[PDB]
Enzyme design. Sequence first.
Site, mmCIF file in Angstrom:
data_model
loop_
_atom_site.group_PDB
_atom_site.id
_atom_site.type_symbol
_atom_site.label_atom_id
_atom_site.label_comp_id
_atom_site.label_asym_id
_atom_site.label_seq_id
_atom_site.Cartn_x
_atom_site.Cartn_y
_atom_site.Cartn_z
ATOM 1 N N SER A 494 0.862 -1.198 0.000
ATOM 2 C CA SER A 494 0.000 0.000 0.000
ATOM 3 C C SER A 494 0.892 1.239 0.000
ATOM 4 O O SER A 494 1.748 1.379 -0.894
ATOM 5 C CB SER A 494 -0.979 -0.046 1.185
ATOM 6 O OG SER A 494 -1.971 -1.048 1.053
ATOM 7 N N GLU A 577 -3.481 -7.188 -9.556
ATOM 8 C CA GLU A 577 -2.717 -5.949 -9.632
ATOM 9 C C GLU A 577 -1.503 -6.030 -10.556
ATOM 10 O O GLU A 577 -0.781 -5.036 -10.686
ATOM 11 C CB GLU A 577 -2.249 -5.527 -8.223
ATOM 12 C CG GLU A 577 -3.317 -4.842 -7.398
ATOM 13 C CD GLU A 577 -2.853 -4.441 -6.005
ATOM 14 O OE1 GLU A 577 -1.845 -4.967 -5.497
ATOM 15 O OE2 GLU A 577 -3.503 -3.565 -5.419
ATOM 16 N N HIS A 605 -5.429 -6.840 -3.295
ATOM 17 C CA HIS A 605 -4.487 -5.860 -2.768
ATOM 18 C C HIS A 605 -3.808 -6.362 -1.505
ATOM 19 O O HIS A 605 -2.579 -6.283 -1.368
ATOM 20 C CB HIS A 605 -5.220 -4.544 -2.504
ATOM 21 C CG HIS A 605 -4.316 -3.439 -2.073
ATOM 22 N ND1 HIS A 605 -3.548 -2.719 -2.960
ATOM 23 C CD2 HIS A 605 -4.032 -2.951 -0.845
ATOM 24 C CE1 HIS A 605 -2.835 -1.828 -2.295
ATOM 25 N NE2 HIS A 605 -3.111 -1.948 -1.012
#
Length: 653
Positions: A494, A577, A605
Amino acid sequence: EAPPVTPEVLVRLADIGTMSASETTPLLSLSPDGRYVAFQVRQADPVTNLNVFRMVVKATDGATDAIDVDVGGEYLFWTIPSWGYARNAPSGANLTIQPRWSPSGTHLAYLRQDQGRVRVWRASVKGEGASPVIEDAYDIEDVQWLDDNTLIYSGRPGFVEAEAEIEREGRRGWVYDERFHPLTGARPRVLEPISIVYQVLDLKTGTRRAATPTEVARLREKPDPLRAMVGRTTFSVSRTDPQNINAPTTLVARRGEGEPVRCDEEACQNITRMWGDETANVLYFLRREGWASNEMALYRMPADALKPVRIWHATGLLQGCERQAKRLICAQESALQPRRLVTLNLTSGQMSPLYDPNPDLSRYRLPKVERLTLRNRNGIEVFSDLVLPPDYQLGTRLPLVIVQYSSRGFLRGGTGDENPILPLATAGFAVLSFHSPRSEASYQRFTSPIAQSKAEYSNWRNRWNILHTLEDLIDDLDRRGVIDPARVGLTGLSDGATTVHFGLINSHRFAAAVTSSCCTDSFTASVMNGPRISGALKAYGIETDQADDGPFWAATSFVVNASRLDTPLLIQSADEEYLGALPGFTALQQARKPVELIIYPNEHHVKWQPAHRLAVYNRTIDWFRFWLMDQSDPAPDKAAQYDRWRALRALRQ
């Protein structure tokens, strides 16, 4: 003797509630009479690649053993509307399951997922009984008892109709527009607004009816943790500048009809949760305090004045606390203590164990933990934890791995439970568990977090402040003769991932790196996000209308910086991703830099499958052992891996 903490141990440590639980996370429930607490335990099995969920009930007097009143269920993804989309792709975090006691204290009701559909289940609190109870075309989002035989529940069937409408529209093809988010799939997403619907089930008949507006308002209303009543005094929290989102709040007391009175003590500032107790004439409240807000503290304040006295404080986190008379029942977490259930004595300070779903971790040979504190060049207080290998002798210069954590508590895997803090120390690394400090912008006046974000991203000011803080921490451990500054690894997920990409470009501090996602570049922020999110990120300071070779993206893009990037980089990416990584990854290969991209299927994620998590842990340990210790594991099933990496190392000639 005493066994070491390994990746195999770490991934199996049981947990309670969503990974990133904080003070107000409703992860536990007291029975109406306060004699029992209900909470879900999650335990990951990397061999079956499944999580085992159990609903647990323990008696708050600690006299009886806990009882599994249900076992089973699939991993339930926590989901929210987020960009004007009704239901984004899951972040990967598990939903916190808040058990609801029946008025009788006889049954629990709670959400559970099987075969990809979320149902309401009911369970005997002891007399044990499984059985789903409410099921619909949509997932149940919430449930309460109206009485011992009636349940109200919420959900969105209009979301399911909108999907059916998207399917129909595809017969003629979809216009690529605001509905598309390409990174996560090739179909239009449902746009807000999608209404919530409330129905009630009679458990005697099996009949559903609509919920009355009165019943809706009882489910739709949620308790305020920053308001409490004690007799005729209403307690609340406010700022002298109510629109400045960074102004500190102060406890305020509204005595009967009179004007609100502000508390003067510094202890009254920035409360995170408060409890009113009318038996004792007392308000209790929780907050963060100390250097860089590194500690939790509990205050007891006689309700007829404004003089709080601290009764408990510690590093770590307290989560989901609920009051039973003179006791707080909390989830509690600490550097060497995974999330457990605990009791806090509301008159003395005393904390006492209630339920620990993991063995006492002190039976293992534990790494040694030490908190680091400094003030950075912007004048901002910083803390972080230094984790040292168990048998460590001051005088040995160690390689250092930096794991970034955006929450507090147990040294697990950093922000996405992705980088194994204690296993890395067991393998002989120093580990910095890094807590990024407040930004400069956060001390200035902003009426909107979006405008604050924009000022933080201006010339990457906050990123530089984060990087300079990291360098200050490395320098500090270098002065102590603890680390070898030429053998520093950096990891991130992140926000930590963006700091990795920025850190590799704008310093020579790092000799190896791991990241769970790639690429702070215009391709990922603009193309792969689709025009809606791409248009909207602009106001946050993400220059999604600028080219990659411009001043903004040149600070972070691997496409632009490919040939100067000599830090070995491992990317362990969810398949959801990985598209964003391809250009940057291709530019680095084309430039003969040591990169490797790993793709995990059906991931998000944040990764949720235990076998994936265990392989991430292991590859990351292998990666840093190879680049920072020049060591390899002779295991045959790793032979292809080390040939791959030896060739990457040979590119350096």
